[PDB]
Amino acid sequence: LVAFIGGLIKNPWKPVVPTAEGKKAVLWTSGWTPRFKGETIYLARATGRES
Amino acid sequence: IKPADMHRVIKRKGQESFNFGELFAYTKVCSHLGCPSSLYEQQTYRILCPCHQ
Amino acid sequence: MHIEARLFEILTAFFALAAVVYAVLTAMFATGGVEWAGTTALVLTTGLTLITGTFFRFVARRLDTRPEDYEDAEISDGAGELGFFAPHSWWPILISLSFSTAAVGAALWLPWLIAAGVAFVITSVCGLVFEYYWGPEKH
Amino acid sequence: QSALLRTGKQLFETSCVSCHGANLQGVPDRGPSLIGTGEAAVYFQVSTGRMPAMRGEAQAPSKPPHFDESQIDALGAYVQANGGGPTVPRDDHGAVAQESLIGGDVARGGDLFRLNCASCHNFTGKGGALSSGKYAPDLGDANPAQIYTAMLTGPQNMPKFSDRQLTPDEKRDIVAYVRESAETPSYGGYGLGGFGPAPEGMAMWIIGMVAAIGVAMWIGSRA
Amino acid sequence: GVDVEDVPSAEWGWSHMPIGVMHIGGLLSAAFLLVMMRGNHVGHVEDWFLIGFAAVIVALVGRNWWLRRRGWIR
Amino acid sequence: LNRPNMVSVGTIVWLSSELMFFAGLFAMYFTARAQAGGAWPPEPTELNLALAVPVTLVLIASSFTCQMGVFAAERGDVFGLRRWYVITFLMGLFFVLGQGYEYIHLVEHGTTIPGSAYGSVFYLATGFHGLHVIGGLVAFVLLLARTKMSKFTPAQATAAIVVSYYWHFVDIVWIALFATIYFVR
Amino acid sequence: DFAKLAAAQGDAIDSRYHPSAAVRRQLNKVFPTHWSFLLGEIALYSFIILLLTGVWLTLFFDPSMAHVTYDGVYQPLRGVQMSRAYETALDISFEVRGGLFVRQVHHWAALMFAASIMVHLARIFFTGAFRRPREANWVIGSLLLILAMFEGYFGYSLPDDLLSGTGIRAALSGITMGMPVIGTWLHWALFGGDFPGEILIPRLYALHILLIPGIILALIGAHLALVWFQKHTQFPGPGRTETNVVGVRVMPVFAVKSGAFFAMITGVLGLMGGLLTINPIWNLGPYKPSQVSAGSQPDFYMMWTEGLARLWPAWEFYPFGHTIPQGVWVAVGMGLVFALLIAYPFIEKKVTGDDAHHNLLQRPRDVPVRTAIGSMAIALYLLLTFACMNDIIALKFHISLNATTWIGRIGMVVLPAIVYFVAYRWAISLQRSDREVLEHGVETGIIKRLPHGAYVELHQPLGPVDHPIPLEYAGAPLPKRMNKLGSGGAPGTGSFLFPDPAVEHEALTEAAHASEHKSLTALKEHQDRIH
């Protein structure tokens, strides 16, 4: 049973997302999280179209 | 926000300086179950999530 | 049954006189000629009373006196069988609910609800009309 | 135009002053100010028939227009000249462009509608409910200029889509998608109102299940 | 818990619920309607609707309990 | 047979009330005929008096057949009643189809309920009469089914009599409305 | 020519497998002919449709979350970036002849499957067929109901469109994520990570075409095996007893009836799949986390869940550094409901102490408490279902959204109590009507005025008269109209337009009357002898 279910068990808190403060869990981060301590993140509208 | 209503803005502790004048930015993810709370009623300034109202 | 008829053509006579008087008094001495709404309604009120009175008069021309139309009648004269009166039925409430569904569908203009209410009306009227005529199940 | 402005003023003074103040500044607790709204706002309010209103409530509903096209143009000219703001796109002959507003790209109009608009009506603009008595109406019976001016001047609880937030080509794409979705027949059969699983379940319970139970009653026996 | 005079077909199936279940059910329903006044809403019309319905439920339970306690209702 | 039949008298009084309903519709029509100014019907309305006469004649024929079916049902012959009422049902259906066809041809020629006041009154009155005709057709179908489902008692004959009463009221109202619309104009 | 072939085939079959005794036992099995005993069969037949169409849909569906550009035939989505599952669903709807028809027949069959399972559950619950020895069969049925609900959920989640993707994100992600201790672990076991992952659709496809269908197939097999070898229940009647089954044998009445019902159900499903549109995916577009629609409702068998989440009032808990969100309530809600559905026979067995073998069903009026509870549960389910649809109700019927929300909130308390009270009184009143009929006789609707002025109604006694001797209630339905006892007579035989000669009418009517007397006499002799 352990060798069966164990392939599905994933730690949700394994730091996998880069951040200007190291590696952090997915649920703690989004695309707005800066990644090199001074990153310019623009608020971009979706034109719904190339670019 | 229309300036004629900017006096009505009450600001959260620790976020008093997150707006740039009349422009506020919030998440488009409902805090209940993650649906896009994407119904902006301007005359009531109400953000509405259609998944569970 | 002469009394009921006679009442109806009395109403007919008065209604016809009033309708003609209204038509004449509006054709001349009114602002825009005949009024065309009171006149129509009064003429067809005359028609309503006329139809009812004429049918009752044709019934009275074809009827020997009943106990209830006969003074000095004795209860024993009226003895016998009266007819069929429904002992119980729950179809009227269903017919009313169906017509209410249709009315709501046509108040808030929803053609699908109108069609559903109309189908429900046909079904409940069928149930009411067929209630004492459905035979025993075949099996 | 002097005649046009005078006709607009003589229409406004007998249809709008009781709520808008007779100098286009609002009546305190009847109506808002009318400075800056412009010809586009006037056209969308009157040509839709929403305006004049009659009751102060959660939302003013759409009605048959209370004037004609020329009178709507006169009122738009009046409110525009007294204030100043957005205008309706005109055509080569002085009217408002209807076919010219129909955009080419309908996939892009659909993407823009789903990102900006479908959140309040639905996927195909069939309408949706709002917080307190308000709602976003069904878009089917609205000509292109009304759609364009509703985007351009958000009336009430509609976000305002300026010409730089939604460019004219984007607005025309959205207009094209809305008209296409209104005018497209359902392919799978009878579209059950275009709302999804709710009419589908009602149809199953009232047609499929009713017919199935009736057939079972026919085949089976009582007692 | 019932007689043939009250429920004719009593021998045929489950036909009685103890009145305690109904009384505590009414009290709990009233408590739920009351506790729904704590939450997130600006307006207070719904609070008065909840109070009115809770009052009706408590009045019904109180009358039923009183009449069974005095003997009229059984 | 020394007493009156109450289903008949109830049907008669209710038919008189329905006559009053059509009185309301006639009052709607006559007004706005006097406001047009003589251009009645106004353009682009051109009454198709070549299809309206045939449906009127078919309605009169259906009334005759319905009375013949009443004659059949008065002597207890359920099958003759069924035949005459099926014929009446088919011819009333033809009348409804002709009315719909004239509706279609008129709407195609710019005459609609929102289009004009004449259109408003004309379609209102004629459509309500058509709804009454459709109700009569439903009554015919229900009566035929009831005759199919039980032995033909005098109660069935009474039901057929009152259904024919309703049909006679309907086509008399249509005669009046045809004379008012396509003749007086 | 075929008689010799039949005889030779039967001889070969008997010489090789000797099935004669068993086949004869299965052909002589007696099934009662009540209409409600057909309800379960609907859930069977639709399921078979769900298999058939399902296999068809497996020949064209690619359940990949990989993102591609459409370049299909549907113009209003040309150049739109979508998942591979959405594109293949579009290809089914537009590029395969009859693909739209198969999709719609499949979705309609799913809806009928759910609805017929619900109606069959209502029949089983109100008739008391869950009683001993049929408790495990109720457990199996409840498991089948839950499995069908989740199977349909996964099914319409398969094409990754805006509506189904929004439903996935709301329910299967938000509720799972918020569970107290293992919620995020469950979410990352199921999705393989965060919600907008890459493995969800293939996993749901595998669960939905193979795993859940296999479990449901095995459970339906065990279910029908139990029903077959635990012979069907029956209602109390003339010839009925706890120790017998009265009905028709399998060959040929029951087999032909079941086959014809299958054909008619297939006809209804085909007509609905052709003439009615269901799930027009191409109008919704590909799923995008940044977009949503106003009309966000699942298929109806899940709607109640959303209604619960719409009505429960934002009650959250904050223990030491931890959050227990509102969605947890919803989960518990569902759990409790499912629990309360699985163990109902044992709950009633404990409460009433009734642990006796039961083969004769109960009329719902004879069990007012259980009927009241069932009406209460149905009222609550309907209220939650409509509270799920309160945005559409608000839009179409002019009512504010907050009004429908508060009506639902107050109703989920007030309405079940009113419905319980009304159902209880209504059941007892139906009992009283039965007793009135049994004690005075059927009211014929005929009124006579006696010579002294007495208006009396003619009563038709159902038994002998001394005024009738009052008969004893025997758990069976009673006639209350005289046309149902044969008083309405028979119409003249013919073709609805032309009569047959009176000799044929006499022969047929006399033969039918003789047959009816013979059948009633046979039932009377069997009843008298056995008792």
Ligand SMILES: CCCCCCCCCCCCCCCC(=O)O[C@H](COC(=O)CCCCCCC[C@@H](C)CCCCCCCCC)COP(=O)(O)O[C@H]1[C@H](O)[C@H](O)[C@@H](O)[C@@H](O)[C@@H]1O
């Ligand atoms: C099984 C019977 C089904 C027969 C199907 C067999 C027919 C064969 C071919 C079918 C082809 C499809 C039919 C026409 C193709 C078609 O779809 O036609 C729609 C029309 O729909 C309507 O309303 C018309 C309603 C009249 C239909 C009445 C039948 C409905 C039944 C099925 C409902 C019974 C269940 C009742 C439920 C409740 C009962 C319980 C209380 C467009 O209406 P539209 O005028 O453009 O407005 C819309 C708006 O949503 C909006 O205005 C929008 O702006 C527009 O874009 C358009 O969507």
Ligand SMILES: CC(C)=CCC/C(C)=C/CC/C(C)=C/CC/C(C)=C/CC/C(C)=C/CC/C(C)=C/CC/C(C)=C/CC1=C(C)C(=O)c2ccccc2C1=O
């Ligand atoms: C929750 C609540 C209180 C709602 C009240 C709104 C309402 C119906 C008010 C009516 C006024 C009242 C209260 C009248 C009382 C008198 C009575 C008893 C009337 C009975 C008739 C009623 C209540 C009818 C309403 C039935 C009803 C609400 C059904 C649910 C609505 C549903 C499921 C709509 C689904 C549905 C939609 C939305 C379509 O667009 C569509 C388009 C094309 C074909 C089919 C459909 C379809 O089925």
Ligand code: HEC
């Ligand atoms: C009182 C019943 C009013 C009458 C008379 C007129 N208007 Fe109005 N208007 C009124 C309200 C309460 C509102 C805002 C809320 C709403 O339901 O719309 C408005 C709004 C407008 C607007 C839009 C303003 C904006 O910022 O978008 C316009 C352009 C407008 N009103 C014009 C207008 C015209 C032309 C009128 C005469 C036909 C008129 N209003 C009358 C209230 C009332």
Ligand code: HEC
């Ligand atoms: C918030 C919810 C929105 C958003 C994001 C959009 N719309 Fe709509 N809309 C909304 C409301 C409350 C109203 C009512 C207008 C009023 O009460 O004065 C409308 C109206 C429209 C209309 C007019 C429909 C008609 O009168 O026939 C149209 C054509 C329309 N809305 C379209 C539309 C488009 C194209 C949008 C995306 C740019 C869009 N809406 C968004 C509410 C809301």
Ligand code: HEM
């Ligand atoms: C109780 C059994 C089942 C239920 C309730 C059910 C329900 C559904 C529903 C509602 C859909 C949505 C279809 C649409 O919206 O277009 C769906 C999709 C699908 N079903 Fe099923 N299904 C069942 C069994 C099966 C089986 C047994 C198979 C395969 C043998 C299958 C194959 C599919 C496939 C491949 C899809 C996705 C393709 C598409 O959506 O067009 N289903 N299912």
Ligand code: FES
């Ligand atoms: S996800 Fe927004 S309210 Fe539920």
